[PDB]
Design a protein around this ligand. Sequence first.
Ligand SMILES: CNC(=O)c1cccc2cc[nH]c12
Ligand SMILES: CNC(=O)c1cccc2cc[nH]c12
Ligand SMILES: [Cl-]
Ligand SMILES: [Cl-]
Ligand SMILES: [Cl-]
Lengths: 695, 697
Amino acid sequence: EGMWLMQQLGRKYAQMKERGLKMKEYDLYNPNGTSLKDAVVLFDGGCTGEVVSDRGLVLTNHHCGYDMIQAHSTLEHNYLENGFWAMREADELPNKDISVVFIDKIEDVTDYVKKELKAIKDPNSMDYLSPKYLQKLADKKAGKNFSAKNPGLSVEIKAFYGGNLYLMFTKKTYTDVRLVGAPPSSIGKFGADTDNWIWPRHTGDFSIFRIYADKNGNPAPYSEDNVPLKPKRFFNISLGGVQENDYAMIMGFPGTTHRYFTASEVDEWKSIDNDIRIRMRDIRQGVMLREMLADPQIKIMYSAKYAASQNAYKRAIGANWAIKTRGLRQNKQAMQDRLIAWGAKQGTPRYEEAVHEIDATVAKRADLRRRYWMIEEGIIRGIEFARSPIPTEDETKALQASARKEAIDKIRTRYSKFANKDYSAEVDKKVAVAMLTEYLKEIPYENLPLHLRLVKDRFAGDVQAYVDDIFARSVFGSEAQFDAFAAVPSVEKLAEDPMVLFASSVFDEYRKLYNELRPYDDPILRAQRTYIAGLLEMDGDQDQFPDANLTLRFTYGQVKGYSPRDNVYYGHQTTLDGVMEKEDPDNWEFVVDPKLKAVYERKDFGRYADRSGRMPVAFCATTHTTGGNSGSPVMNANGELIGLNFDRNWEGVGGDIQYLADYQRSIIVDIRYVLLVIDKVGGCQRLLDEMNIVP
Amino acid sequence: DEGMWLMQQLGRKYAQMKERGLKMKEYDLYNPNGTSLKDAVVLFDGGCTGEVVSDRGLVLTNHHCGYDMIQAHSTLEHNYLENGFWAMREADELPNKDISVVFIDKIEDVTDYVKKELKAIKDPNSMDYLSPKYLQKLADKKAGKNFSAKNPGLSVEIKAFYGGNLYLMFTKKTYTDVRLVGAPPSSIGKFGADTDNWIWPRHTGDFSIFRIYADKNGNPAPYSEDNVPLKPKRFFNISLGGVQENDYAMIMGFPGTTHRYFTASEVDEWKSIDNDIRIRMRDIRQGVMLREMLADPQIKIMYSAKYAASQNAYKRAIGANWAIKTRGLRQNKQAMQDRLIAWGAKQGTPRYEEAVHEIDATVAKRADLRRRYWMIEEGIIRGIEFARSPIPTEDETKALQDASARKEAIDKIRTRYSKFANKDYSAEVDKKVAVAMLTEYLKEIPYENLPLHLRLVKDRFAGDVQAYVDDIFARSVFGSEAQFDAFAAVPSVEKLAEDPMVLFASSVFDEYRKLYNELRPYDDPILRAQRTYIAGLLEMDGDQDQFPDANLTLRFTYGQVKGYSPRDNVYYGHQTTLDGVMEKEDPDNWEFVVDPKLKAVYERKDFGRYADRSGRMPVAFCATTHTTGGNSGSPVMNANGELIGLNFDRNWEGVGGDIQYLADYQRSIIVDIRYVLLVIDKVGGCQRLLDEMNIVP
Ligand SMILES: CNC(=O)c1cccc2cc[nH]c12
Ligand SMILES: CNC(=O)c1cccc2cc[nH]c12
Ligand SMILES: [Cl-]
Ligand SMILES: [Cl-]
Ligand SMILES: [Cl-]
């Protein structure tokens, strides 16, 4: 049920042993020695990765190394659709702007931070959560020129439990991380967007990289002289597979959770955040779908835009299902009522006062937050011409020196990016008419961005006419309209441009709402410090984990399926047979790689198939994971690698607020399927040979 | 393969049934010379199956079987279709016009009689051995002179089985006074509605209650206010013990049609012509209908039923083609015929190989014709609404060419035009469907094979299908109300003879009839060869594990209450519960609305003695019984013959079961009798119906 701090391993060890853990405590996490923890990395600032060889080979998800596979791909060598398999270390491709972060040391610095904070004065100061303030304390503690005395190292202090616990992390960062191997996108992204958040899953979501360093294994930027890193710890790969009920554990960097939400915050997340996102994206996606289905060229231009909007839409549907069916609101209400009753008993009323302050702040910001989500979902992300060019003061104080041509060249560059090869003004007008009709129904005239008041005032409520007039008269309405402007440009034309006025107006309102809403975060945050302190003093820092905050955590559970609905059961493991069942040659998402199809037909599964002869693909577990856990190593009871985490099912997305034992699962690619693809699809034996594969 | 067995076959199947769990005595289930459970089974309204459940003639069947009767008695004042109907006294039960219940009184093997009569052959190629007229002449001869007059309510019928190798005579007792007694609201009776058609898991309470009425002596009588409820020979006891996984289950009913003795060439034809054309053509039709319904809420209202009606057989064809592609149906038919051919070669009897060859040759010869027939039927006859627009009759055209009979002809044409262009017809939606359907039709059917008017697309319109369809409506007398009225004011024979819509409709119907007539002669050599083919199969492997094709006659099937795995890592259990109804609840979707009385029952757990051992309220279960269309409403029995449910559907994965039974996929979808009794009790409050049933603990 939790995402535990490494410090909490001692207090959780006995239960983990009861659940099946066989390894010694300090072999997993040692605060003053080498352990399995030293083989986990933060891959490219978001994902998790893991070292799997004494030469710095790193495994992570295909969707984690996707940008690097795409950057090295050309029409000549398309690594994204064909895969990439460097047959020698010298063939491994360097990557610009990549990093791998090791968590070298972790220390509890709570007393230090709390004593430094006492020099306050302002009791409402937010310095206790300020990265700038906490970095000043981290540098003070580490020393004057720490990074120069310990090269490649850096320190960071983070708040936990709403400002009740602080940890200082000593990090070692490597920036020479090279692409080694990747399956084709047909394997790496088999489900593609249709199977996102879906269990059963049949995606071989993996990619292979390598950490490079100088002669002494110290961090160094890309250099042709860099040598592969010999890490102090790497995972052994298990070939024993998984069975139902097997103990499993994960280490990784979960990003965010909201475990200490009040009941009022759950209601707000549902009725504002999720309902607005669901309704607004449903309108946007509906119009996009009609247009993509009717014109194959529109499908090409809008596929990525449609898929990008669907991802958080699906999350919101999944989260609202948990609020409606799993009693999230009620369990938060029970959590706060129990603290309020215990505080009354002890004579300490500050916890009830804290929950009341949160409720009052939530109730007060309701209309503002509704207006913010309505404009953000409805217009800022809903309508493409909202992100059309807005002339700067530098560009206007140029059109009225003769760098008038330099002003127009900068405006043209931005116009070309807005009206790019994937932009359809006709599709955008149709989306805007449906999105603005909904926006104008929900937001009253007095709360409208100034230019939208023209719908009622100048266009007699005809939204279609208003949108038609924006494109007919705007210099960004077509290429010919822009060129006519660029030939005779005046500041008076830009100041009265209907598209510029629309874009400026909606951005002004979006910033005004953001600025007016920002002051409401602080009383909530301060009250959460008192609220979580009460919860911890009452029930202990034992079965209540601190919210995720992109720091290293461990979670444990079992390889287990679940029943999604009445009379339906999803098992704990998918097979290669499931890939073949889903095969569809006339659908890019469900195309099956011919080398993999042949492997399946011949049953060329080597040492990777199970005891029954079926080739495993993926499994699911009751571990508690969230965004940031992509690429996380999944370990056995002996700490051996059995898979990589790559997703979680939609039924469990409400798990960020309340873990769902009967529904929430981590979706993991079986390590045996990873090895089968490297071996029979990539034919990259050197990668298998450098790993320590245990029978 | 698993079987829809003749009643005569119970004797030789009994031992296996007992070894599979059957506990009742053979003659208590079926006795040719006495009362048995078979006497409580009826053919409900000529299609469905039903069952007698009380000593006062109460009959249970599906909600979709009694749907028309519930709809005919419904008004805006008392909407029984939407709220349910529960007659609180026998006198309140509603009579029904044109209803019937047929009991199978006696069944007799008359094979030797029919085969001896057939020996008086005046042509060896005669189809009289399958002729209902001929077989009725033999049935009347055997029953005697004036049998119907000397035995009122009874009738005799002889049917061919095993392709003309076995014949049975059925003595039927028909009752026509069958009254509506009870029905749940449509929210329960058709809970899944079209979304869950052919779907397992299923949560639909598909049942309705009727009562057979008869004269003072329990003899058939048409509706009369003097009719008394029938005291039947036999009725089912209701079991409350429920079902468990692996329990023995059995069904009696009237399965309509199967194709168990198809050759491999007939499976290929079913796939590549019948199913592929239906799939492709309905996909085009449904796609255009969906875009129009989604864009205009008034179009959704007008085309919902038309869209749902087209989707039903489309889904069946997708399910059947999935079995041909994944379950090896073609290969198993090929293995079946190769084995007979090899055995015939050893017996020195080449007639079986000659028979399979005649079938293959006939299938190969009719291929282009059959492709053209399905292409026009799916593409135009069903695909385009203006294909069924008015065509002036020879007598209507004669009337328009010096009398007052011209206004009588115009009134008749107007009546047909108003039925075509009714409140649910959109000419704009029809033009869009026709453009897409004709574009596909014109791509598949060559100019020389086109219905005469479609040749104008290339000849007069330069291949512009949109222009051709636009011109049909712009110039046609049936293109709009104003166009019809202008014609009706000044009607001329010449205007109808040159009308583009009349010419289109006539042309496509002419080609549809020409193709049907040219294809009809191919059925007979196949049928005759099937008589030899099935005779060989029976002589070789016996009339034991090879059931005769379904032909709307009484059959039994048996199996177990068992779920199945539809795909990798997914398992569907054997039973659904009332929780599954609640999970699917959606108030803003008419299909998934939950009745408030039922929702309250679930919340209070007011399940009485109807819940299972774990206090969960069962709704439906599935079984490995072999069923098909005609089995809707069938009684599902326990190992003791007690009623445990009513069959109401089968899953799409098993629709290929009409050709080859699929043990690991095919299931009968059954409404649990405990859920039926819960709805009568806690939703209808109709205690008298529970009291007249014999409920066993
Ligand atoms: C076709 N429908 C979907 O793909 C979908 C819809 C809503 C939520 C989720 C979560 C996963 N998939 C979803
Ligand atoms: C709503 N249901 C469908 O879309 C569907 C589509 C194709 C086959 C089947 C069988 C049952 N349902 C089907
Ligand atoms: Cl290291
Ligand atoms: Cl012979
Ligand atoms: Cl099977």
